[PDB]
A paper describes a structure:
Thus, the BBSome is a key regulator of the composition of transmembrane proteins in the ciliary membrane, and is thought to be evolutionarily related to other transmembrane protein trafficking complexes including clathrin coats and the COPI and COPII coatomers. The recruitment of the BBSome to ciliary membranes (where it binds transmembrane protein substrates) is mediated by a highly specific interaction with ARL6 (also known as BBS3). Here, we use single-particle cryo-EM to determine structures of the native bovine BBSome complex with and without ARL6 at 3.5 Å and 3.1 Å resolution, respectively. The structures reveal the mechanism of ARL6-mediated activation and provide new insights into the pathogenesis of BBS-causing mutations and the evolutionary relationship between the BBSome and other transmembrane protein trafficking complexes.
However, our 3.5 Å resolution structure of the BBSome:ARL6:GTP complex shows that the head remains in a closed, downward conformation even in the presence of ARL6. Rather, BBS1βprop swivels in its cradle between BBS4 and BBS7 to accommodate ARL6. This swiveling action involves a rotation of approximately 25° and a movement of 13 Å away from BBS2βprop. The N-terminal half of BBS4 shows a small 2–3 Å displacement to accommodate the movement of BBS1βprop. The swiveling of BBS1βprop opens a central cavity in the BBSome with dimensions of 50 × 15 Å, wide enough to accommodate a polypeptide chain. This cavity is flanked by the newly exposed edges of BBS1βprop, BBS2β-prop and BBS7βprop as well as BBS4 and BBS8 in the body. The first and last blades of BBS1βprop interact with the switch two loop and helices α3 (residues 75–78) and α4 (residues 98–108) of the GTP-bound ARL6. Density for GTP and the ordered switch loops of ARL6 are clearly visible in our reconstruction. We also see an additional interaction between ARL6 and the loop that connects BBS7βprop with BBS7hx (residues 320–335). This linker is disordered in the BBSome-only structure but binds along the β-edge of the central β-sheet of ARL6.
Numbering used by the authors:
A (entry chain 1): 195 to 406, 424 to 479, 483 to 590
B (entry chain 0): 7 to 58
C (entry chain 4): 29 to 402, 408 to 424
D (entry chain 9): 642 to 828
E (entry chain 8): 64 to 81, 90 to 141, 158 to 499
F (entry chain 1): 1 to 66
């Protein structure tokens, strides 16, 4: 059979709500269900249907006439359960999974995974939100009836715990290590005991006393002399710079055309990109050609690589080989083993030509200055 | 004798938009004298090896 | 025969406190014991992977969680989300559709379909889907995406209503306030823009994206020292940002600190050599400084970066008039007057060039063109009347 | 498609064995380097001292390194033989696919480019990843119409897989979608 | 890597050898901005493992490609060094021959030991030579002993610089600085000592004192190529290109005629707004370049000039020529990809930025641009993997932080 | 300094949570104890431990994790 597991458990008051009243359990099954039990934990009083597995629970009021059940689930939402409603129908999303849930008499705080608290109303309308400096590990309730102080706590991950009322911070403490669980009650014989457990173990018990301009640069004589020369001889500068720009365009076009002629550009309709890396000292170097098809979606079927070296200095096993089908977007490393043959250190260039199989003009090329041999 | 009037107000950015940055101009570092001598002595051996 | 999900609560509590170390160990132990089929040691593990940079193993494990629970809308949502975190939006849409044919009452599917159709440039379907996402459950990000749709597709006339309705509720979001203020700047309104930018600055005093626009608005209506202080507020947070230094250089150019403005403008230009606004500002300041050789250079650069402008060619022609090149100034002024529509300064300056060339014939044509175009500048008023009476 | 997969699996088992042998050789080399640095430190020191059998650990590590090097050499030779036999098998398979359906010269050239990518294996690119990327792309741009599968299953990478099931699935799917009447293209 | 001599393993930050941000000054490693005046003693960072040092460019940690470790007139195996040691007039020149010509440190040390014992250990020169033999044999302390014993005999700038080398080899900057100030107490205005102090201060990367000591060198020499080049570079990159143009025109005035000097003069002239002497300097540079990497750098800088002028086509051609001349030029790839994405070709830009970030991982611009374009189209996984490497390259960036925040927000 | 510190210990391996740890009266006479279902040091050994004063009085094994 397919049973379930219980994850969250709190109590709910029957009719009196004093120190001697009878309380009834409320279980949150792993199956998305809430079981409102009996005073003696043997029979079911109610079965409530929830849309997601609850993680945190809050029970306010008296069960018979006025019960409010807030359920923080795993889907990052608070669902409230009232009388006659088998389904909540009043849900509030937090945007992040709720790490805690503590119910103040009027406001309901929800601790977010985004390191903050969000105070909502029991009708489904947020009224405030406060930001934490670090993560929220555990939220509990600090209630002292002498001063009527019922404030939510916060066990932050930055090695501190800050007690929070409606909006104000107070009584922030420090710990030698970030704290994972806090409890405030009448432990021992003090109405104001707070016991706290470190993320690494250990215990810290605290008893609350009842007596609570810019970098704008500078300019020197050189700058004013240069600006004076520019103001007195601006025309000649303009003319000679335009002449120099014309000559530069001329020479750049010349070199671009010469490169196109020799096809020496490792980057050059017909999309490709290749560059050759050399690795290793010693007589044997690993020469890996990183080749890449740079197109939207079009493979390149017939291509082939041919090496040009000095056959007296380098012994290439396979100086010519086909390349795989180049899929657009993947860098193919195609490696070879160059080997220096000269007994004396001689560094000679090696050319690489990538070309079609039906054409004789290289599609593109690359050069590599082979380093020294460091032989034997 | 009329002087052309220039606008007194420039163009001001009203939002910071992430633009691809370029690498920065590279001042070629100079060399020492020992380094030049070492490189020339390294290449002279190559030249004599090729010239034999 | 042991219970399947024995420790889902413990795994959830370890994952929700941002541990990702003990949670992983408990996940591995649970999976080794149960030989799989846990559906929540895989789910939380994939979410942890997604929290790290990896969005591939997250997709794989969400695929496994969908395979375990074939009818579970949240698993399909998570798989489509893992797709959308990669570049594939069509497949994300086609998985969100299946996630919707199992649950027709959630806002997340519609919001994510909107943001996907946005990346797919299908604006009708995106717009309708985001309207639906509002009607199911209004969220801030849906409002932002709808405003983005109405800005990309059309005009701010459609975005002002949406952003106003958005800021109407939950008015503490800095993004909404700041974007509505920016869109007010984009139009003639300068008052409500200041209102919303101040509303933002009350919450966040050091908001860089709002300080920049506030300082811009301030510079526009004089009072450069207030904008300079606004920029001093954020100078150290962003010490190298071209827009900030361009605005600071225009501040220093306002109060006749031309050298300390050339400095900031050149620094901003070095950090962004492809930004036409800094080039235009450098050209203008070098015109005001009467250098006329760098002014032409920077204005020609800004022309080569944004050529469909009228003031650029006007300033380039004013730089060419003092460079002993009057024919180039003629053709530049022709380009400008053809490419300018609502700035009479170009017409007045071309009239000045013509009248100084001894023509006095087409100078009247440029004067009449200016007077047809038209009104605040103190020194463009006098030359208006002096080139009138002397013609 | 079934006596063809066993050769692929033999090839991939040899590849995985080679990667394991190499990651073991890495550890052996690190041990040798550490013990060698210890011995060099003992050498540079003036004062005499017992070797503490550091030389024995060095000899043991050296024997391990030589054994692993010989193992890697033999695995490389076995991998090369398996690659040649796999090349012959895939030649036959492309032939039988180009006959089993009236495939022209263009589609036969596409198949020869996709299935016969390399001449031998290297520690950065192997037959499996390359043919898998090529087949995933050929099914992506030509033989698929659903975008969900196009993004979920029909993806291409150039890293050594942990299993050959994706490659075999893609090959069977290729033959299937050819049987229904599909045809290959490039654009 | 394989030689450990520093006593302290993790010493205080500021006492070990092992300014403008990478948004202004180009870089060579994660940090270590590019320097002026390459000298063959520059280490400029160090690798972590043998694999990283091998799988990187051969000239990324030294001015020259790294090695594995740092008829005939007279046959060394024929002469009895015990007889040439008796004659010091022969012994000194013979030792200089063996040491600097043949590079036989063991026989040189044998000769030097016999000579020193012949002189009854009373001449500092043989002590310095034995110390040098030791220092290049590997024994630093055994060399520091001889250098100290030679300083005791007679103070010389040579022995001071030798001890400085020894102390820097043992990773002890603050000992070398005290020794240098002691030497300056002996020689009140020596230029090599001040330059060594400045080199140590720049290796420790506190430029605010290296500039002071280079200024002292200038007050002494005023033709020093090292101090002039360093102060000039620092003046150029801290948005003062006119002072750098002056500092480099000084080297031009002193007969220096290089490819580096003229490209530097071109950069300075253009960025100091002197448009008449800008491009002729780049032309002289292209003329003087005795390499294929120098030509590529000059074409890269000409493309920078062009893109500062506008006319992105000329800069396109110049970057492509920088690639043609040096295939492993990552800045050219990055800038050409920026111009491509300016045109519209996104896939070309992606591939070129991937190539750039593969060639130089220590740079931050290719990673940032790849992450930016990815995030623009989607692919938040690639955007994260690239922005995180950007933050690894330039960890105090700003746009990288906003990108990482947006990404980590999309992941939840 | 409103929070008077009482005990700070670090050897107590108490890896409970903020919900499986509750204090109440357990033998009358106005002496409140604190019962907690503590996991293992890692989460392997479920052990119910109760605390009176600041010395451990009874820890006993539990079938499964509370």
């Amino acid at each position: 059979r397919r049973q379930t597991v219980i994850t969250t458990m709190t109590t709910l008051k029957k009719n009196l709500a004093d120190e001697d009243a009878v309380s009834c359990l409320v279980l949150g099954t792993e199956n998305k269900e809430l079981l409102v039990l009996d005073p003696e934990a043997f029979t079911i009083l109610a079965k409530m249907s929830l849309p997601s597995v609850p993680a945190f629970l809050e029970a306010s009021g008296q069960f018979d006439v006025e019960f409010r059940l807030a359920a923080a689930c795993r889907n990052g939402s608070i669902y409230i359960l009232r009388r006659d409603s088998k389904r909540p129908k009043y849900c509030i999303e937090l945007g992040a999974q709720p790490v805690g849930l503590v119910g103040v008499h009027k406001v309901l705080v929800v601790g977010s995974n985004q390191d903050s608290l969000h105070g909502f109303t029991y009708k489904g309308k947020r009224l405030w939100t406060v930001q934490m400096p670090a993560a929220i590990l555990a939220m509990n309730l600090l209630e002292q009836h002498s001063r009527g102080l019922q404030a939510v706590m916060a066990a932050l991950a930055n090695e501190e715990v800050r007690i929070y009322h409606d909006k104000v911070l107070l009584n922030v403490i420090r710990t030698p290590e970030a704290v994972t669980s806090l409890c405030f009650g009448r432990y021992g014989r003090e109405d104001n005991t707070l016991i706290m457990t470190t993320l690494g173990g250990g215990l810290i018990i605290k008893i609350l006393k009842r007596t609570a301009k810019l970098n704008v640069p500078r300019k020197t004589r050189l700058y004013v002399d240069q600006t004076l020369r520019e103001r007195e001889a601006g025309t000649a500068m303009h003319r000679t710079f335009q002449a120099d720009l014309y000559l530069l365009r001329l020479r750049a076009a010349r070199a671009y055309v010469q490169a196109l002629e020799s096809s020496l550009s490792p980057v050059s309709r017909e999309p490709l990109k290749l560059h050759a890396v050399v690795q290793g000292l010693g007589p044997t170097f690993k020469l890996t050609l990183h080749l890449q098809n740079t197109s939207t979606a079009r493979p390149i079927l017939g291509l082939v690589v041919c090496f040009l070296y000095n056959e007296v200095l380098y012994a290439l096993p396979r100086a010519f080989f086909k390349v795989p089908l180049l899929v657009p977007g993947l860098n193919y490393p195609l490696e070879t083993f160059v080997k220096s043959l000269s007994d004396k250190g001689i560094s000679d260039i090696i050319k690489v030509l990538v070309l079609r199989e039906g054409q004789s003009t290289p599609l593109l090329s690359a050069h590599i200055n082979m380093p020294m041999s460091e032989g034997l | 004798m009329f002087r052309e009037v220039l606008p007194k107000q420039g163009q001001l950015y009203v939002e910071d938009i992430t633009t691809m940055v370029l690498c920065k101009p590279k001042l070629l570092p100079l060399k020492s004298l020992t380094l030049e001598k070492l490189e020339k002595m390294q290449q002279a051996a190559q030249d004599t090896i090729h010239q034999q | 025969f042991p219970i399947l999900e024995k420790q889902n609560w413990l795994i959830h509590l370890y994952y929700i406190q941002k541990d990702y170390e003990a949670c992983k160990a408990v996940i591995k132990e649970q999976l080794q014991e149960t030989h799989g089929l846990c559906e929540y040691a895989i789910y939380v593990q994939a979410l942890i992977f997604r929290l790290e940079g990896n969005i591939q193993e997250s997709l794989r494990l969400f695929q496994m969680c969908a395979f375990l629970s074939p009818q579970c809308a949240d698993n399909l949502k998570q798989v489509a989300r893992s797709l959308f975190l990669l570049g594939k939006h069509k497949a994300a849409i086609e998985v969100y559709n299946e996630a919707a044919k199992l649950n027709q009452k959630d806002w997340e599917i519609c919001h994510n379909l909107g943001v996907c159709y946005i990346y797919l440039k299908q604006f009708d379907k995106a717009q309708d889907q985001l309207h639906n996402a509002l009607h199911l459950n209004r969220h801030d990000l849906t409002y932002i995406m709808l405003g983005k749709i109405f800005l990309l597709k059309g005009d701010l006339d459609k975005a002002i209503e949406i952003y106003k309705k958005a800021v109407e509720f939950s008015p503490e979001n800095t993004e909404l306030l700041t974007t509505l203020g920016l869109l007010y700047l984009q139009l003639g309104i300068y008052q409500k823009a200041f209102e919303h930018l101040g509303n933002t600055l009350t919450y966040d005093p050091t908001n860089y994206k709002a300080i920049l626009a506030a300082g811009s608005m301030m510079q526009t209506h004089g009072d450069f020292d207030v904008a300079l202080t606004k920029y001093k507020v954020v100078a150290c947070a962003v010490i190298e940002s071209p827009p900030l230094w361009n605005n600071i250089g225009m501040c220093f150019f306002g109060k006749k600190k031309y050298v300390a403005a050339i400095s900031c403008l050149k620094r901003a230009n070095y950090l962004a050599p492809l930004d036409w606004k800094i080039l235009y500002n450098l050209g203008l300041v070098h015109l005001t400084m009467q250098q006329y050789a760098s002014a032409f250079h920077f204005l020609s650069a800004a022309i080569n970066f944004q050529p469909k402008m009228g003031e650029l060619y006007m300033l380039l022609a004013v730089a060419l008039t003092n460079l002993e090149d009057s024919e180039n100034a003629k053709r530049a002024y022709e380009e400008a007057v053809r490419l300018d529509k609502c700035n009479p300064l170009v017409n007045l300056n071309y009239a000045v060039l013509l009248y100084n060339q001894g023509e006095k014939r087409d100078a009247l044509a440029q004067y009449q063109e200016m007077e047809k175009k038209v009104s605040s500048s103190l020194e463009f008023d006098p030359e208006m009347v002096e080139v009138a009476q002397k013609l | 498609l079934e006596e063809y997969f066993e050769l692929i699996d033999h090839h991939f088992e040899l590849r995985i064995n080679g990667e394991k042998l190499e990651e073991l050789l890495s550890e052996r080399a690190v041990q040798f380097r550490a013990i060698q640095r210890r011995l060099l430190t003992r050498f540079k020191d003036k004062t005499p001292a017992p070797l503490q059998h550091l030389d024995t650990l060095l000899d043991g590590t050296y024997k391990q390194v030589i054994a692993l090097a010989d193992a890697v050499e033999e695995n490389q030779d076995n991998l090369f033989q398996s690659f040649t036999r796999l090349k012959s098998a895939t030649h036959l398979v492309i032939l039988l696919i180009g006959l089993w359906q009236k495939l022209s010269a263009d589609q036969i050239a596409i198949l020869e480019a996709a299935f016969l990518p390399l001449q031998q294996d290297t520690q950065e690119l192997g037959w499996e990843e390359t043919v898998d990327a090529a087949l995933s792309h050929l099914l992506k741009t030509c033989l698929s119409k659903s975008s969900k599968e196009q993004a979920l299953n029909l993806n291409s990478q150039l890293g050594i897989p942990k299993d050959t099931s994706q490659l075999k699935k893609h090959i069977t799917l290729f033959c299937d979608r050819l049987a229904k009447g599909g045809r290959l293209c490039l654009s | 890597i394989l030689d450990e001599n520093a006593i302290a393993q993790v010493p205080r930050p500021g006492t070990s050898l092992k300014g403008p941000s990478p948004a202004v000054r180009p870089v060579t490693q994660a940090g270590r901005p590019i320097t002026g005046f390459l000298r063959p003693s520059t280490q400029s960072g160090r690798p972590g493992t043998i694999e990283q040092a091998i799988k990187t460019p051969r000239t990324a940690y030294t001015a020259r490609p790294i090695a594995s470790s740092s008829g005939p007139f007279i046959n060394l195996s024929r002469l009895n060094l015990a007889k040439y040691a008796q004659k010091p007039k022969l012994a000194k020149a013979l030792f200089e021959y063996i040491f600097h010509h043949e590079n036989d440190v063991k026989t040189a040390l044998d000769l030097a030991a016999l000579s020193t014992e012949h002189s009854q250990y009373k001449d500092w020169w043989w002590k310095v030579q034995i110390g040098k033999c030791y220092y290049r044999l590997g024994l630093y302390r055994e060399a520091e002993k001889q250098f100290k014993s030679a300083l005791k005999q007679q103070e010389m700038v040579d022995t001071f610089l030798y001890l400085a080398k020894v102390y820097i080899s043992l990773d002890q900057p603050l000992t070398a600085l005290n020794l240098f100030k002691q030497g300056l107490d002996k020689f009140p205005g020596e230029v090599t000592l001040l330059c060594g102090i400045a080199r140590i201060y720049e290796e420790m990367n506190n430029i605010s004192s290296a500039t002071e000591y280079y200024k002292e060198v200038l007050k002494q020499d005023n033709t020093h190529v090292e101090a002039i080049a360093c102060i000039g570079s620092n003046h150029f990159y801290t948005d003062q290109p006119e002072v750098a143009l002056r500092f480099y025109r000084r080297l031009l005035q002193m007969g220096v005629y290089n490819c580096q000097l003229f490209n530097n003069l071109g950069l300075c002239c253009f960025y100091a707004q002197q448009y008449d002497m800008t491009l002729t300097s780049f032309e002289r540079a292209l003329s003087l370049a005795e390499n294929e990497e120098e030509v590529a750098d000059v074409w890269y800088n000409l493309g920078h000039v062009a893109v500062g002028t506008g006319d992105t086509n000329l800069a396109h051609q110049c970057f492509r020529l920088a690639l043609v001349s040096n295939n492993q030029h990552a800045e050219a790839y990055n800038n050409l990809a920026v111009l491509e994405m300016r045109r519209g070709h996104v896939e070309q830009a992606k591939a070129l930025l991937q190539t750039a970030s593969s060639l130089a991982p220590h740079m931050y611009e290719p990673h940032f641009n790849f992450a930016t374009i990815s995030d623009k189209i989607g692919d938040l996984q690639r955007s994260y993997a690239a922005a995180k490497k950007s933050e690894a390259a330039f960890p105090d960036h700003v746009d990288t932080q906003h990108l990482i925040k947006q990404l980590e927000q999309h992941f939840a | 300094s409103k929070w008077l510190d009482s005990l700070s210990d670090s050897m107590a391996n108490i890896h409970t949570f903020s919900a499986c740890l509750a204090l109440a009266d357990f033998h009358g006479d106005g002496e409140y104890k604190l019962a907690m279902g503590d996991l293992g040091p890692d989460g392997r050994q479920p052990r119910l431990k109760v605390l009176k004063g600041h010395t451990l009085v009874s820890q006993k094994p539990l079938p499964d994790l509370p």
